[PDB]
Design a protein around this ligand. Structure first.
Ligand SMILES: [Mg+2]
Lengths: 749, 744
């Protein structure tokens, strides 16, 4: 009975149950509760011992004596309306005073900017003063009826992880942990000296679990103690006067506070990055990386592993940028939130192994009397499992309080099953990826550096604005294709790699994800058009290839490829003619049929041509597919485009032949089993690979197949908590029928 | 009570004609062609200046009107590409002008780069309508813009295709810009006048230029703009334009990248220069026709439609033409107002619906229903801006076969005349001064948010609703332009400004909102007590500010998230369900309970909080404006369903801003708008006086006659209580389409 690949949390006064559960779950590693030297009875088990390290917090005794060395962020004030030629702007009224504090030490006139937001102009620094007695900037000689703001440097006085916990589990009047910035040599020396001593003081730790490193991700709170700004990939909170001044020297130009506050966007990953953002990323990453390497080296010299948590103070690491391997990190561990976040961890190059921390975390918010944590446990396993077959992770484990999980025998038995199943998958496949059946490339401004990081604001929390796009990643995360992320820069520099079958471009207009004005670069349009014409496949979602204003008559610059454009109220004089919808088609074959709606749709018919209204639009909606957020007034560019769904006087789903290749338009794609199948059929259809679809496929969309040619195996998995019957089709055209229980898996030669 | 009513007649109908003219109180008759010694009625005869003379135009086919046509986009797959000119167009309507040098008058464009392709890189095929382009970039799209002759008049062509006349000869239109054709038109008209002594009113239907109307190769409408002047060019006109204006127009100044100068486009200098050139010419020639009619003892009357381009009825100087009347088609409230509000003429006439034709006058149908419908929509508007005369078109013989309809017309004509008699034709008292602000201003009064006459659709109805609501509302409506506000500020008599429409249209205004002087003027005015009502995407300007889309977001308390600010949590304050603005919205108790029960979203990372989990509903806002959100928690949200904002109000100094995401016309929505206007202008105390409790009825106060009326806008009985100025109430129970008059 398999053992290993499993990390178990421990805690004091819990020797008996720890060994029972380690035995039961086949743990080869134990996570010592933070701080804490652990029970000898636990240490005698001879498991691999994880101890977490918190390098830039939990030492107020240092940082209270060097408060100008805390991390910093540019903050943007509320917009203040001048009603004459003077205006006063309070600095701190919209922000949380327990987290943030204006920096009055570094000359405001050098480091800050007052902006007239109505004109975009910087106000002369001779026209403003910072009040000596309170956090208010006085501006004079400006225009009445304009809005003004200040961008100012703020010390961060409360570490966001310690803060979030405090506020979330109200730890009352417990001391707030103050973060510290290693960019400053005094602090940096304190950090490495402390780490050296801790290494000496921890002979029994096998793995130093850095949780995490030097810089928080963008996270700001308001005066009502709510989250104000968040970007899980953002490096807002990484500046200081010295860092900014060194940057100017090295790069040959001075950043504006505007290059950080970004009009109030705070350099959201959704914004098309410019040179300033790419340069800062590069400057910050060189410095963070140099220092992570030192930590790894020191860990190794002491005989221990270096393991990074993919979260908390992870900024500047850039796990997907070239050179990550140079750090010599042994492992990355992250939170398993779904398939997309499973891949974000799994696909990381340059480490020896990866580790998933599965849900639920062992805490009272889920482990309370009358709750059934086992359901979520299995759910989480199933969403990660489908992804693990496409890109394996090396290890699994859980976090929190063992003594809490131990009170729920059903949950305990569920983990026993998950752990055995994790090891079975690994042992049968040798930890190798399943065969991908097509090569699919997501194209955006960021490319590989943001692999599995697209369409995200906060970690694993899709919302109204992101779910129609995030669903694309979640579908792909466990799909039987090979997925890579590429950038407009890669494409302009090197063309489109010849192994790629399908390119996906998706998002709203004017985001890093669709690409913005890069679509008015004729070389990009030529490259993609030539490639589609020669048998490439282009799948556009939402507002693909969009560029406002460039052409009065063409919003999606590749409207010709995908057969669809969005009306922008500039072309209303042009009657739009919709060809009849094709309801029977390869792409839609697995969509459940609703005869009541189809009948209502067929009875109601198509709008006859009418002046200023065009014609051809179905009077009633066919429906049957959840397309998410609408893209208003999409329409077919000519009548040779194939409309598959065009309900409510606009287009949701369309396909277009373009020379040898095809274009497909999808207006949006929330994740569901049915939509993942829809997407999957789109990939095969657009690449002219219909004849390749059946090999290693499951007839039922609720199940997936993974083929492992090198070990002579395939499996089939049930992605649901319900029994599923399905017919698997093998490469030679043979089939087998399955009856898969709840969350089950079957393996065959 | 008799008169103010125009009746049509065919031939061979003397007896019944006389009966109906006396039933309806007709004081004028519209003849098709001359008959019966029915001859002391005012006689209307239609005149068609620029068609029905094929004998002339076939001898001068280079003097037909012309238009710039934009071809399909053709993909180049190497350094050469061929572009057929006519494949997307109707060949019986349009023919390429091979007469005027293509290399001087046409343009080939690389649509991928926007660059004009050098004339030396293209040729026009000698034997087919195909342009050969060489020395170009592979994988770009290319188009030609070319001059086309218009060989079929669009009124004759619409009517032809509507009742397939088959081989009936096609009327070819002619352009009076050329001297020979102009001379033919005036001489012919001079002669026609001599021959028509019984004709009292020359009903010009219409003048010299068709509105933008182009058909495709499948015989369908391709491009339409009721206000557009696409079909008004010629090599001579363009050459002359350059002499007068000091620059050469590009064909692109007309085809407009495919938009063809839709009135929805923000007009640039070229569009305005052409309007002015064309208008000068057109008006000069219309004045002559009016002069000629006058020296023959006849009235000159203009049809607001068909060939009306260049007249510009709302532009200053229109009065100088000396036109006695405008007649127009009554489609709805908005189109009624469009006719009624025209200055510079002696009287106005509406042609009411239905037209007397078999498409509605057929066995089994009750056209009185439509008759009353049409009359109710116009009436509410006539109260606010009276029209002089009414009447119908079509075959009287067909309508006469429908005695309930005949009774309905009698009821209508009598009621029309009764309103005139009681009020002396004066406009009802307006209770607020309301200005619509856009790029066009008054030249396009009641013409906003329109493509095809009186045909709102999916893309327009959420904004056309604003006009349809105001058309019959008890307030004074003006239309002003950004140039007006920039040159003169905001008139001291205006209570409320409305800005409405999608981003980057003439109706919101586009980049004018990046002009700080505009922003200064509106903000200062609002702050001192003005009212700003923004509909859809008011004040929007893309890209100008990363964190601000609606430039006056601060005024109205609402902006639209454009995916630049997703990192910023949005906090929605609780909705206020009981409020002056929404007071007449019906409360559906199971809906309200479900909404109260689902509660509000608690704040979650990257998701903000405070949005309702279930919708309150109750109001149809039309097309969604995605991801609108409150700029702060001091804004009052009245409707914020589905994680976005439909209705909100914000105090801004002494004034207020209001946001409405869209407003399809209905009695409820009209009422909503009206309460928004009184609220935004801090005039809640003024709302009661001369109002109807029931949104299905409206009140017109005529203080100079010590008199008000209340009208039933529906075909159903409606109970309502009117409040008067003194705080007094009076009750009514009105029948279908009813009216009631009271001493005041
Ligand atoms: Mg030839």
């Amino acid at each position: 009975t398999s053992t290993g690949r499993f990390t178990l949390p421990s805690e004091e006064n819990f020797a008996e149950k720890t060994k029972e559960l380690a035995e039961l779950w086949g743990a080869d590693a134990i996570r010592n509760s933070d701080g804490t030297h652990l029970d000898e009875a636990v240490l005698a088990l001879g498991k691999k011992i994880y101890n977490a390290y918190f390098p830039t917090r939990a030492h107020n005794e240092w940082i209270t004596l060097h408060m100008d060395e805390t991390p910093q962020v540019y903050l943007l004030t509320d917009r203040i309306l001048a009603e004459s030629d003077t205006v006063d702007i309070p600095l701190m009224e919209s922000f949380f005073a327990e987290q943030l504090k204006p920096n009055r030490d570094a000359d405001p006139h050098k480091y800050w900017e007052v902006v007239d937001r109505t004109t975009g102009e910087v106000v002369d620094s001779a026209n403003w003063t910072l009040d000596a007695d309170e956090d208010t900037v006085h501006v004079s000689g400006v225009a009445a009826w304009h809005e003004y703001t200040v961008s100012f440097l703020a010390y961060i006085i409360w570490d966001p992880v310690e803060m979030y916990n405090h506020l979330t589990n109200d730890w009352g009047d417990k001391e707030h942990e103050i973060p510290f910035d290693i960019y400053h040599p005094a602090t940096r020396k304190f950090v490495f000296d402390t780490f050296e001593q801790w290494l000496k003081d921890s002979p029994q730790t096998d793995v130093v679990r850095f949780t995490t490193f030097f810089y928080q991700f963008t996270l700001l709170f308001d005066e009502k103690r709510r989250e104000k700004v968040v970007d899980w990939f953002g490096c807002a909170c990484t500046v200081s006067p010295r860092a900014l001044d060194d940057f100017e020297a090295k790069y040959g130009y001075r950043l504006r506070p505007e290059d950080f506050v970004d009009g109030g966007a705070y350099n959201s990953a959704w914004r098309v990055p410019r040179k300033a953002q790419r340069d800062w990323i590069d400057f910050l990453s060189g410095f963070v990386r140099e220092n992570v390497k030192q930590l790894a080296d020191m860990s190794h010299a002491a005989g221990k592993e270096a393991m990074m948590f993919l979260g908390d103070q992870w900024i500047g690491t850039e796990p997907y940028k070239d050179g990550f391997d140079e750090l010599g990190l042994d492992a990355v561990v992250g939170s398993i939130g779904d398939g997309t976040t499973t891949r974000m961890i799994a696909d990381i190059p340059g480490v020896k192994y990866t580790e998933g921390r599965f849900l639920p975390y062992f805490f009272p918010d889920t482990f309370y009397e009358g709750n059934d944590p086992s359901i979520e446990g299995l759910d989480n396993w199933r969403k990660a499992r489908r992804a693990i077959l496409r890109s394996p992770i090396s290890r699994m484990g859980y976090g929190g309080y063992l003594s809490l999980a131990a009170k729920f025998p059903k949950f305990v038995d569920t983990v026993t099953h998950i752990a055995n199943e994790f090891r079975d998958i690994h042992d049968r496949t040798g930890g190798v990826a399943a065969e991908g059946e097509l090569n699919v490339a997501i194209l955006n401004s960021w490319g590989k550096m943001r692999s599995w990081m697209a369409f995200t604001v906060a970690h694993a929390l899709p919302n109204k604005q992101t779910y129609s796009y995030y669903g694309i990643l979640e579908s792909l995360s466990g799909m039987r294709v090979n997925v890579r992320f590429i950038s407009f820069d890669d494409v302009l520099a090197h063309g489109i790699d010849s192994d790629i079958d399908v390119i996906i471009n998706g998002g709203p207009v004017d985001t890093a994800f669709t690409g913005g004005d890069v679509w008015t670069n004729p070389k990009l349009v030529e490259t993609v058009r030539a490639w589609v014409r020669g048998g490439g496949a282009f799948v556009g979602v939402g507002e693909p290839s969009s560029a406002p204003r460039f052409q009065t008559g063409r919003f999606f610059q590749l409207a010709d490829v995908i057969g669809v454009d969005e009306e922008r109220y500039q072309t209303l004089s042009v009657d739009k003619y919709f060809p009849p919808v094709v309801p029977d088609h390869f792409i839609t074959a697995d969509v459940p049929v609703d005869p009541a709606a189809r009948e209502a749709w067929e009875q109601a018919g198509y709008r006859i041509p009418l002046s200023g209204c065009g014609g051809g639009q179905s009077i009633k909606p066919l429906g049957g597919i959840d397309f998410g957020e609408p893209v208003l007034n999409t329409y077919p560019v000519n009548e040779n485009v194939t409309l598959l769904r065009a309900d409510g006087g606009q287009v949701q789903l369309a396909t277009n032949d373009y020379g040898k290749g095809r274009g497909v338009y999808i207006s949006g794609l929330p994740y569901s089993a049915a939509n993942a199948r829809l997407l999957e059929r789109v990939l095969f259809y657009a690449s002219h690979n219909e004849d390749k679809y059946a090999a290693w496929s499951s007839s039922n969309p609720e199940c997936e197949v993974a083929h492992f040619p090198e070990q002579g195996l395939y499996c089939v998995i049930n992605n649901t908590d319900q029994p599923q019957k399905t017919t698997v089709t093998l490469a030679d055209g043979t089939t087998e029928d399955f009856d898969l229980p709840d969350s089950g898996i079957a393996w065959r030669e």
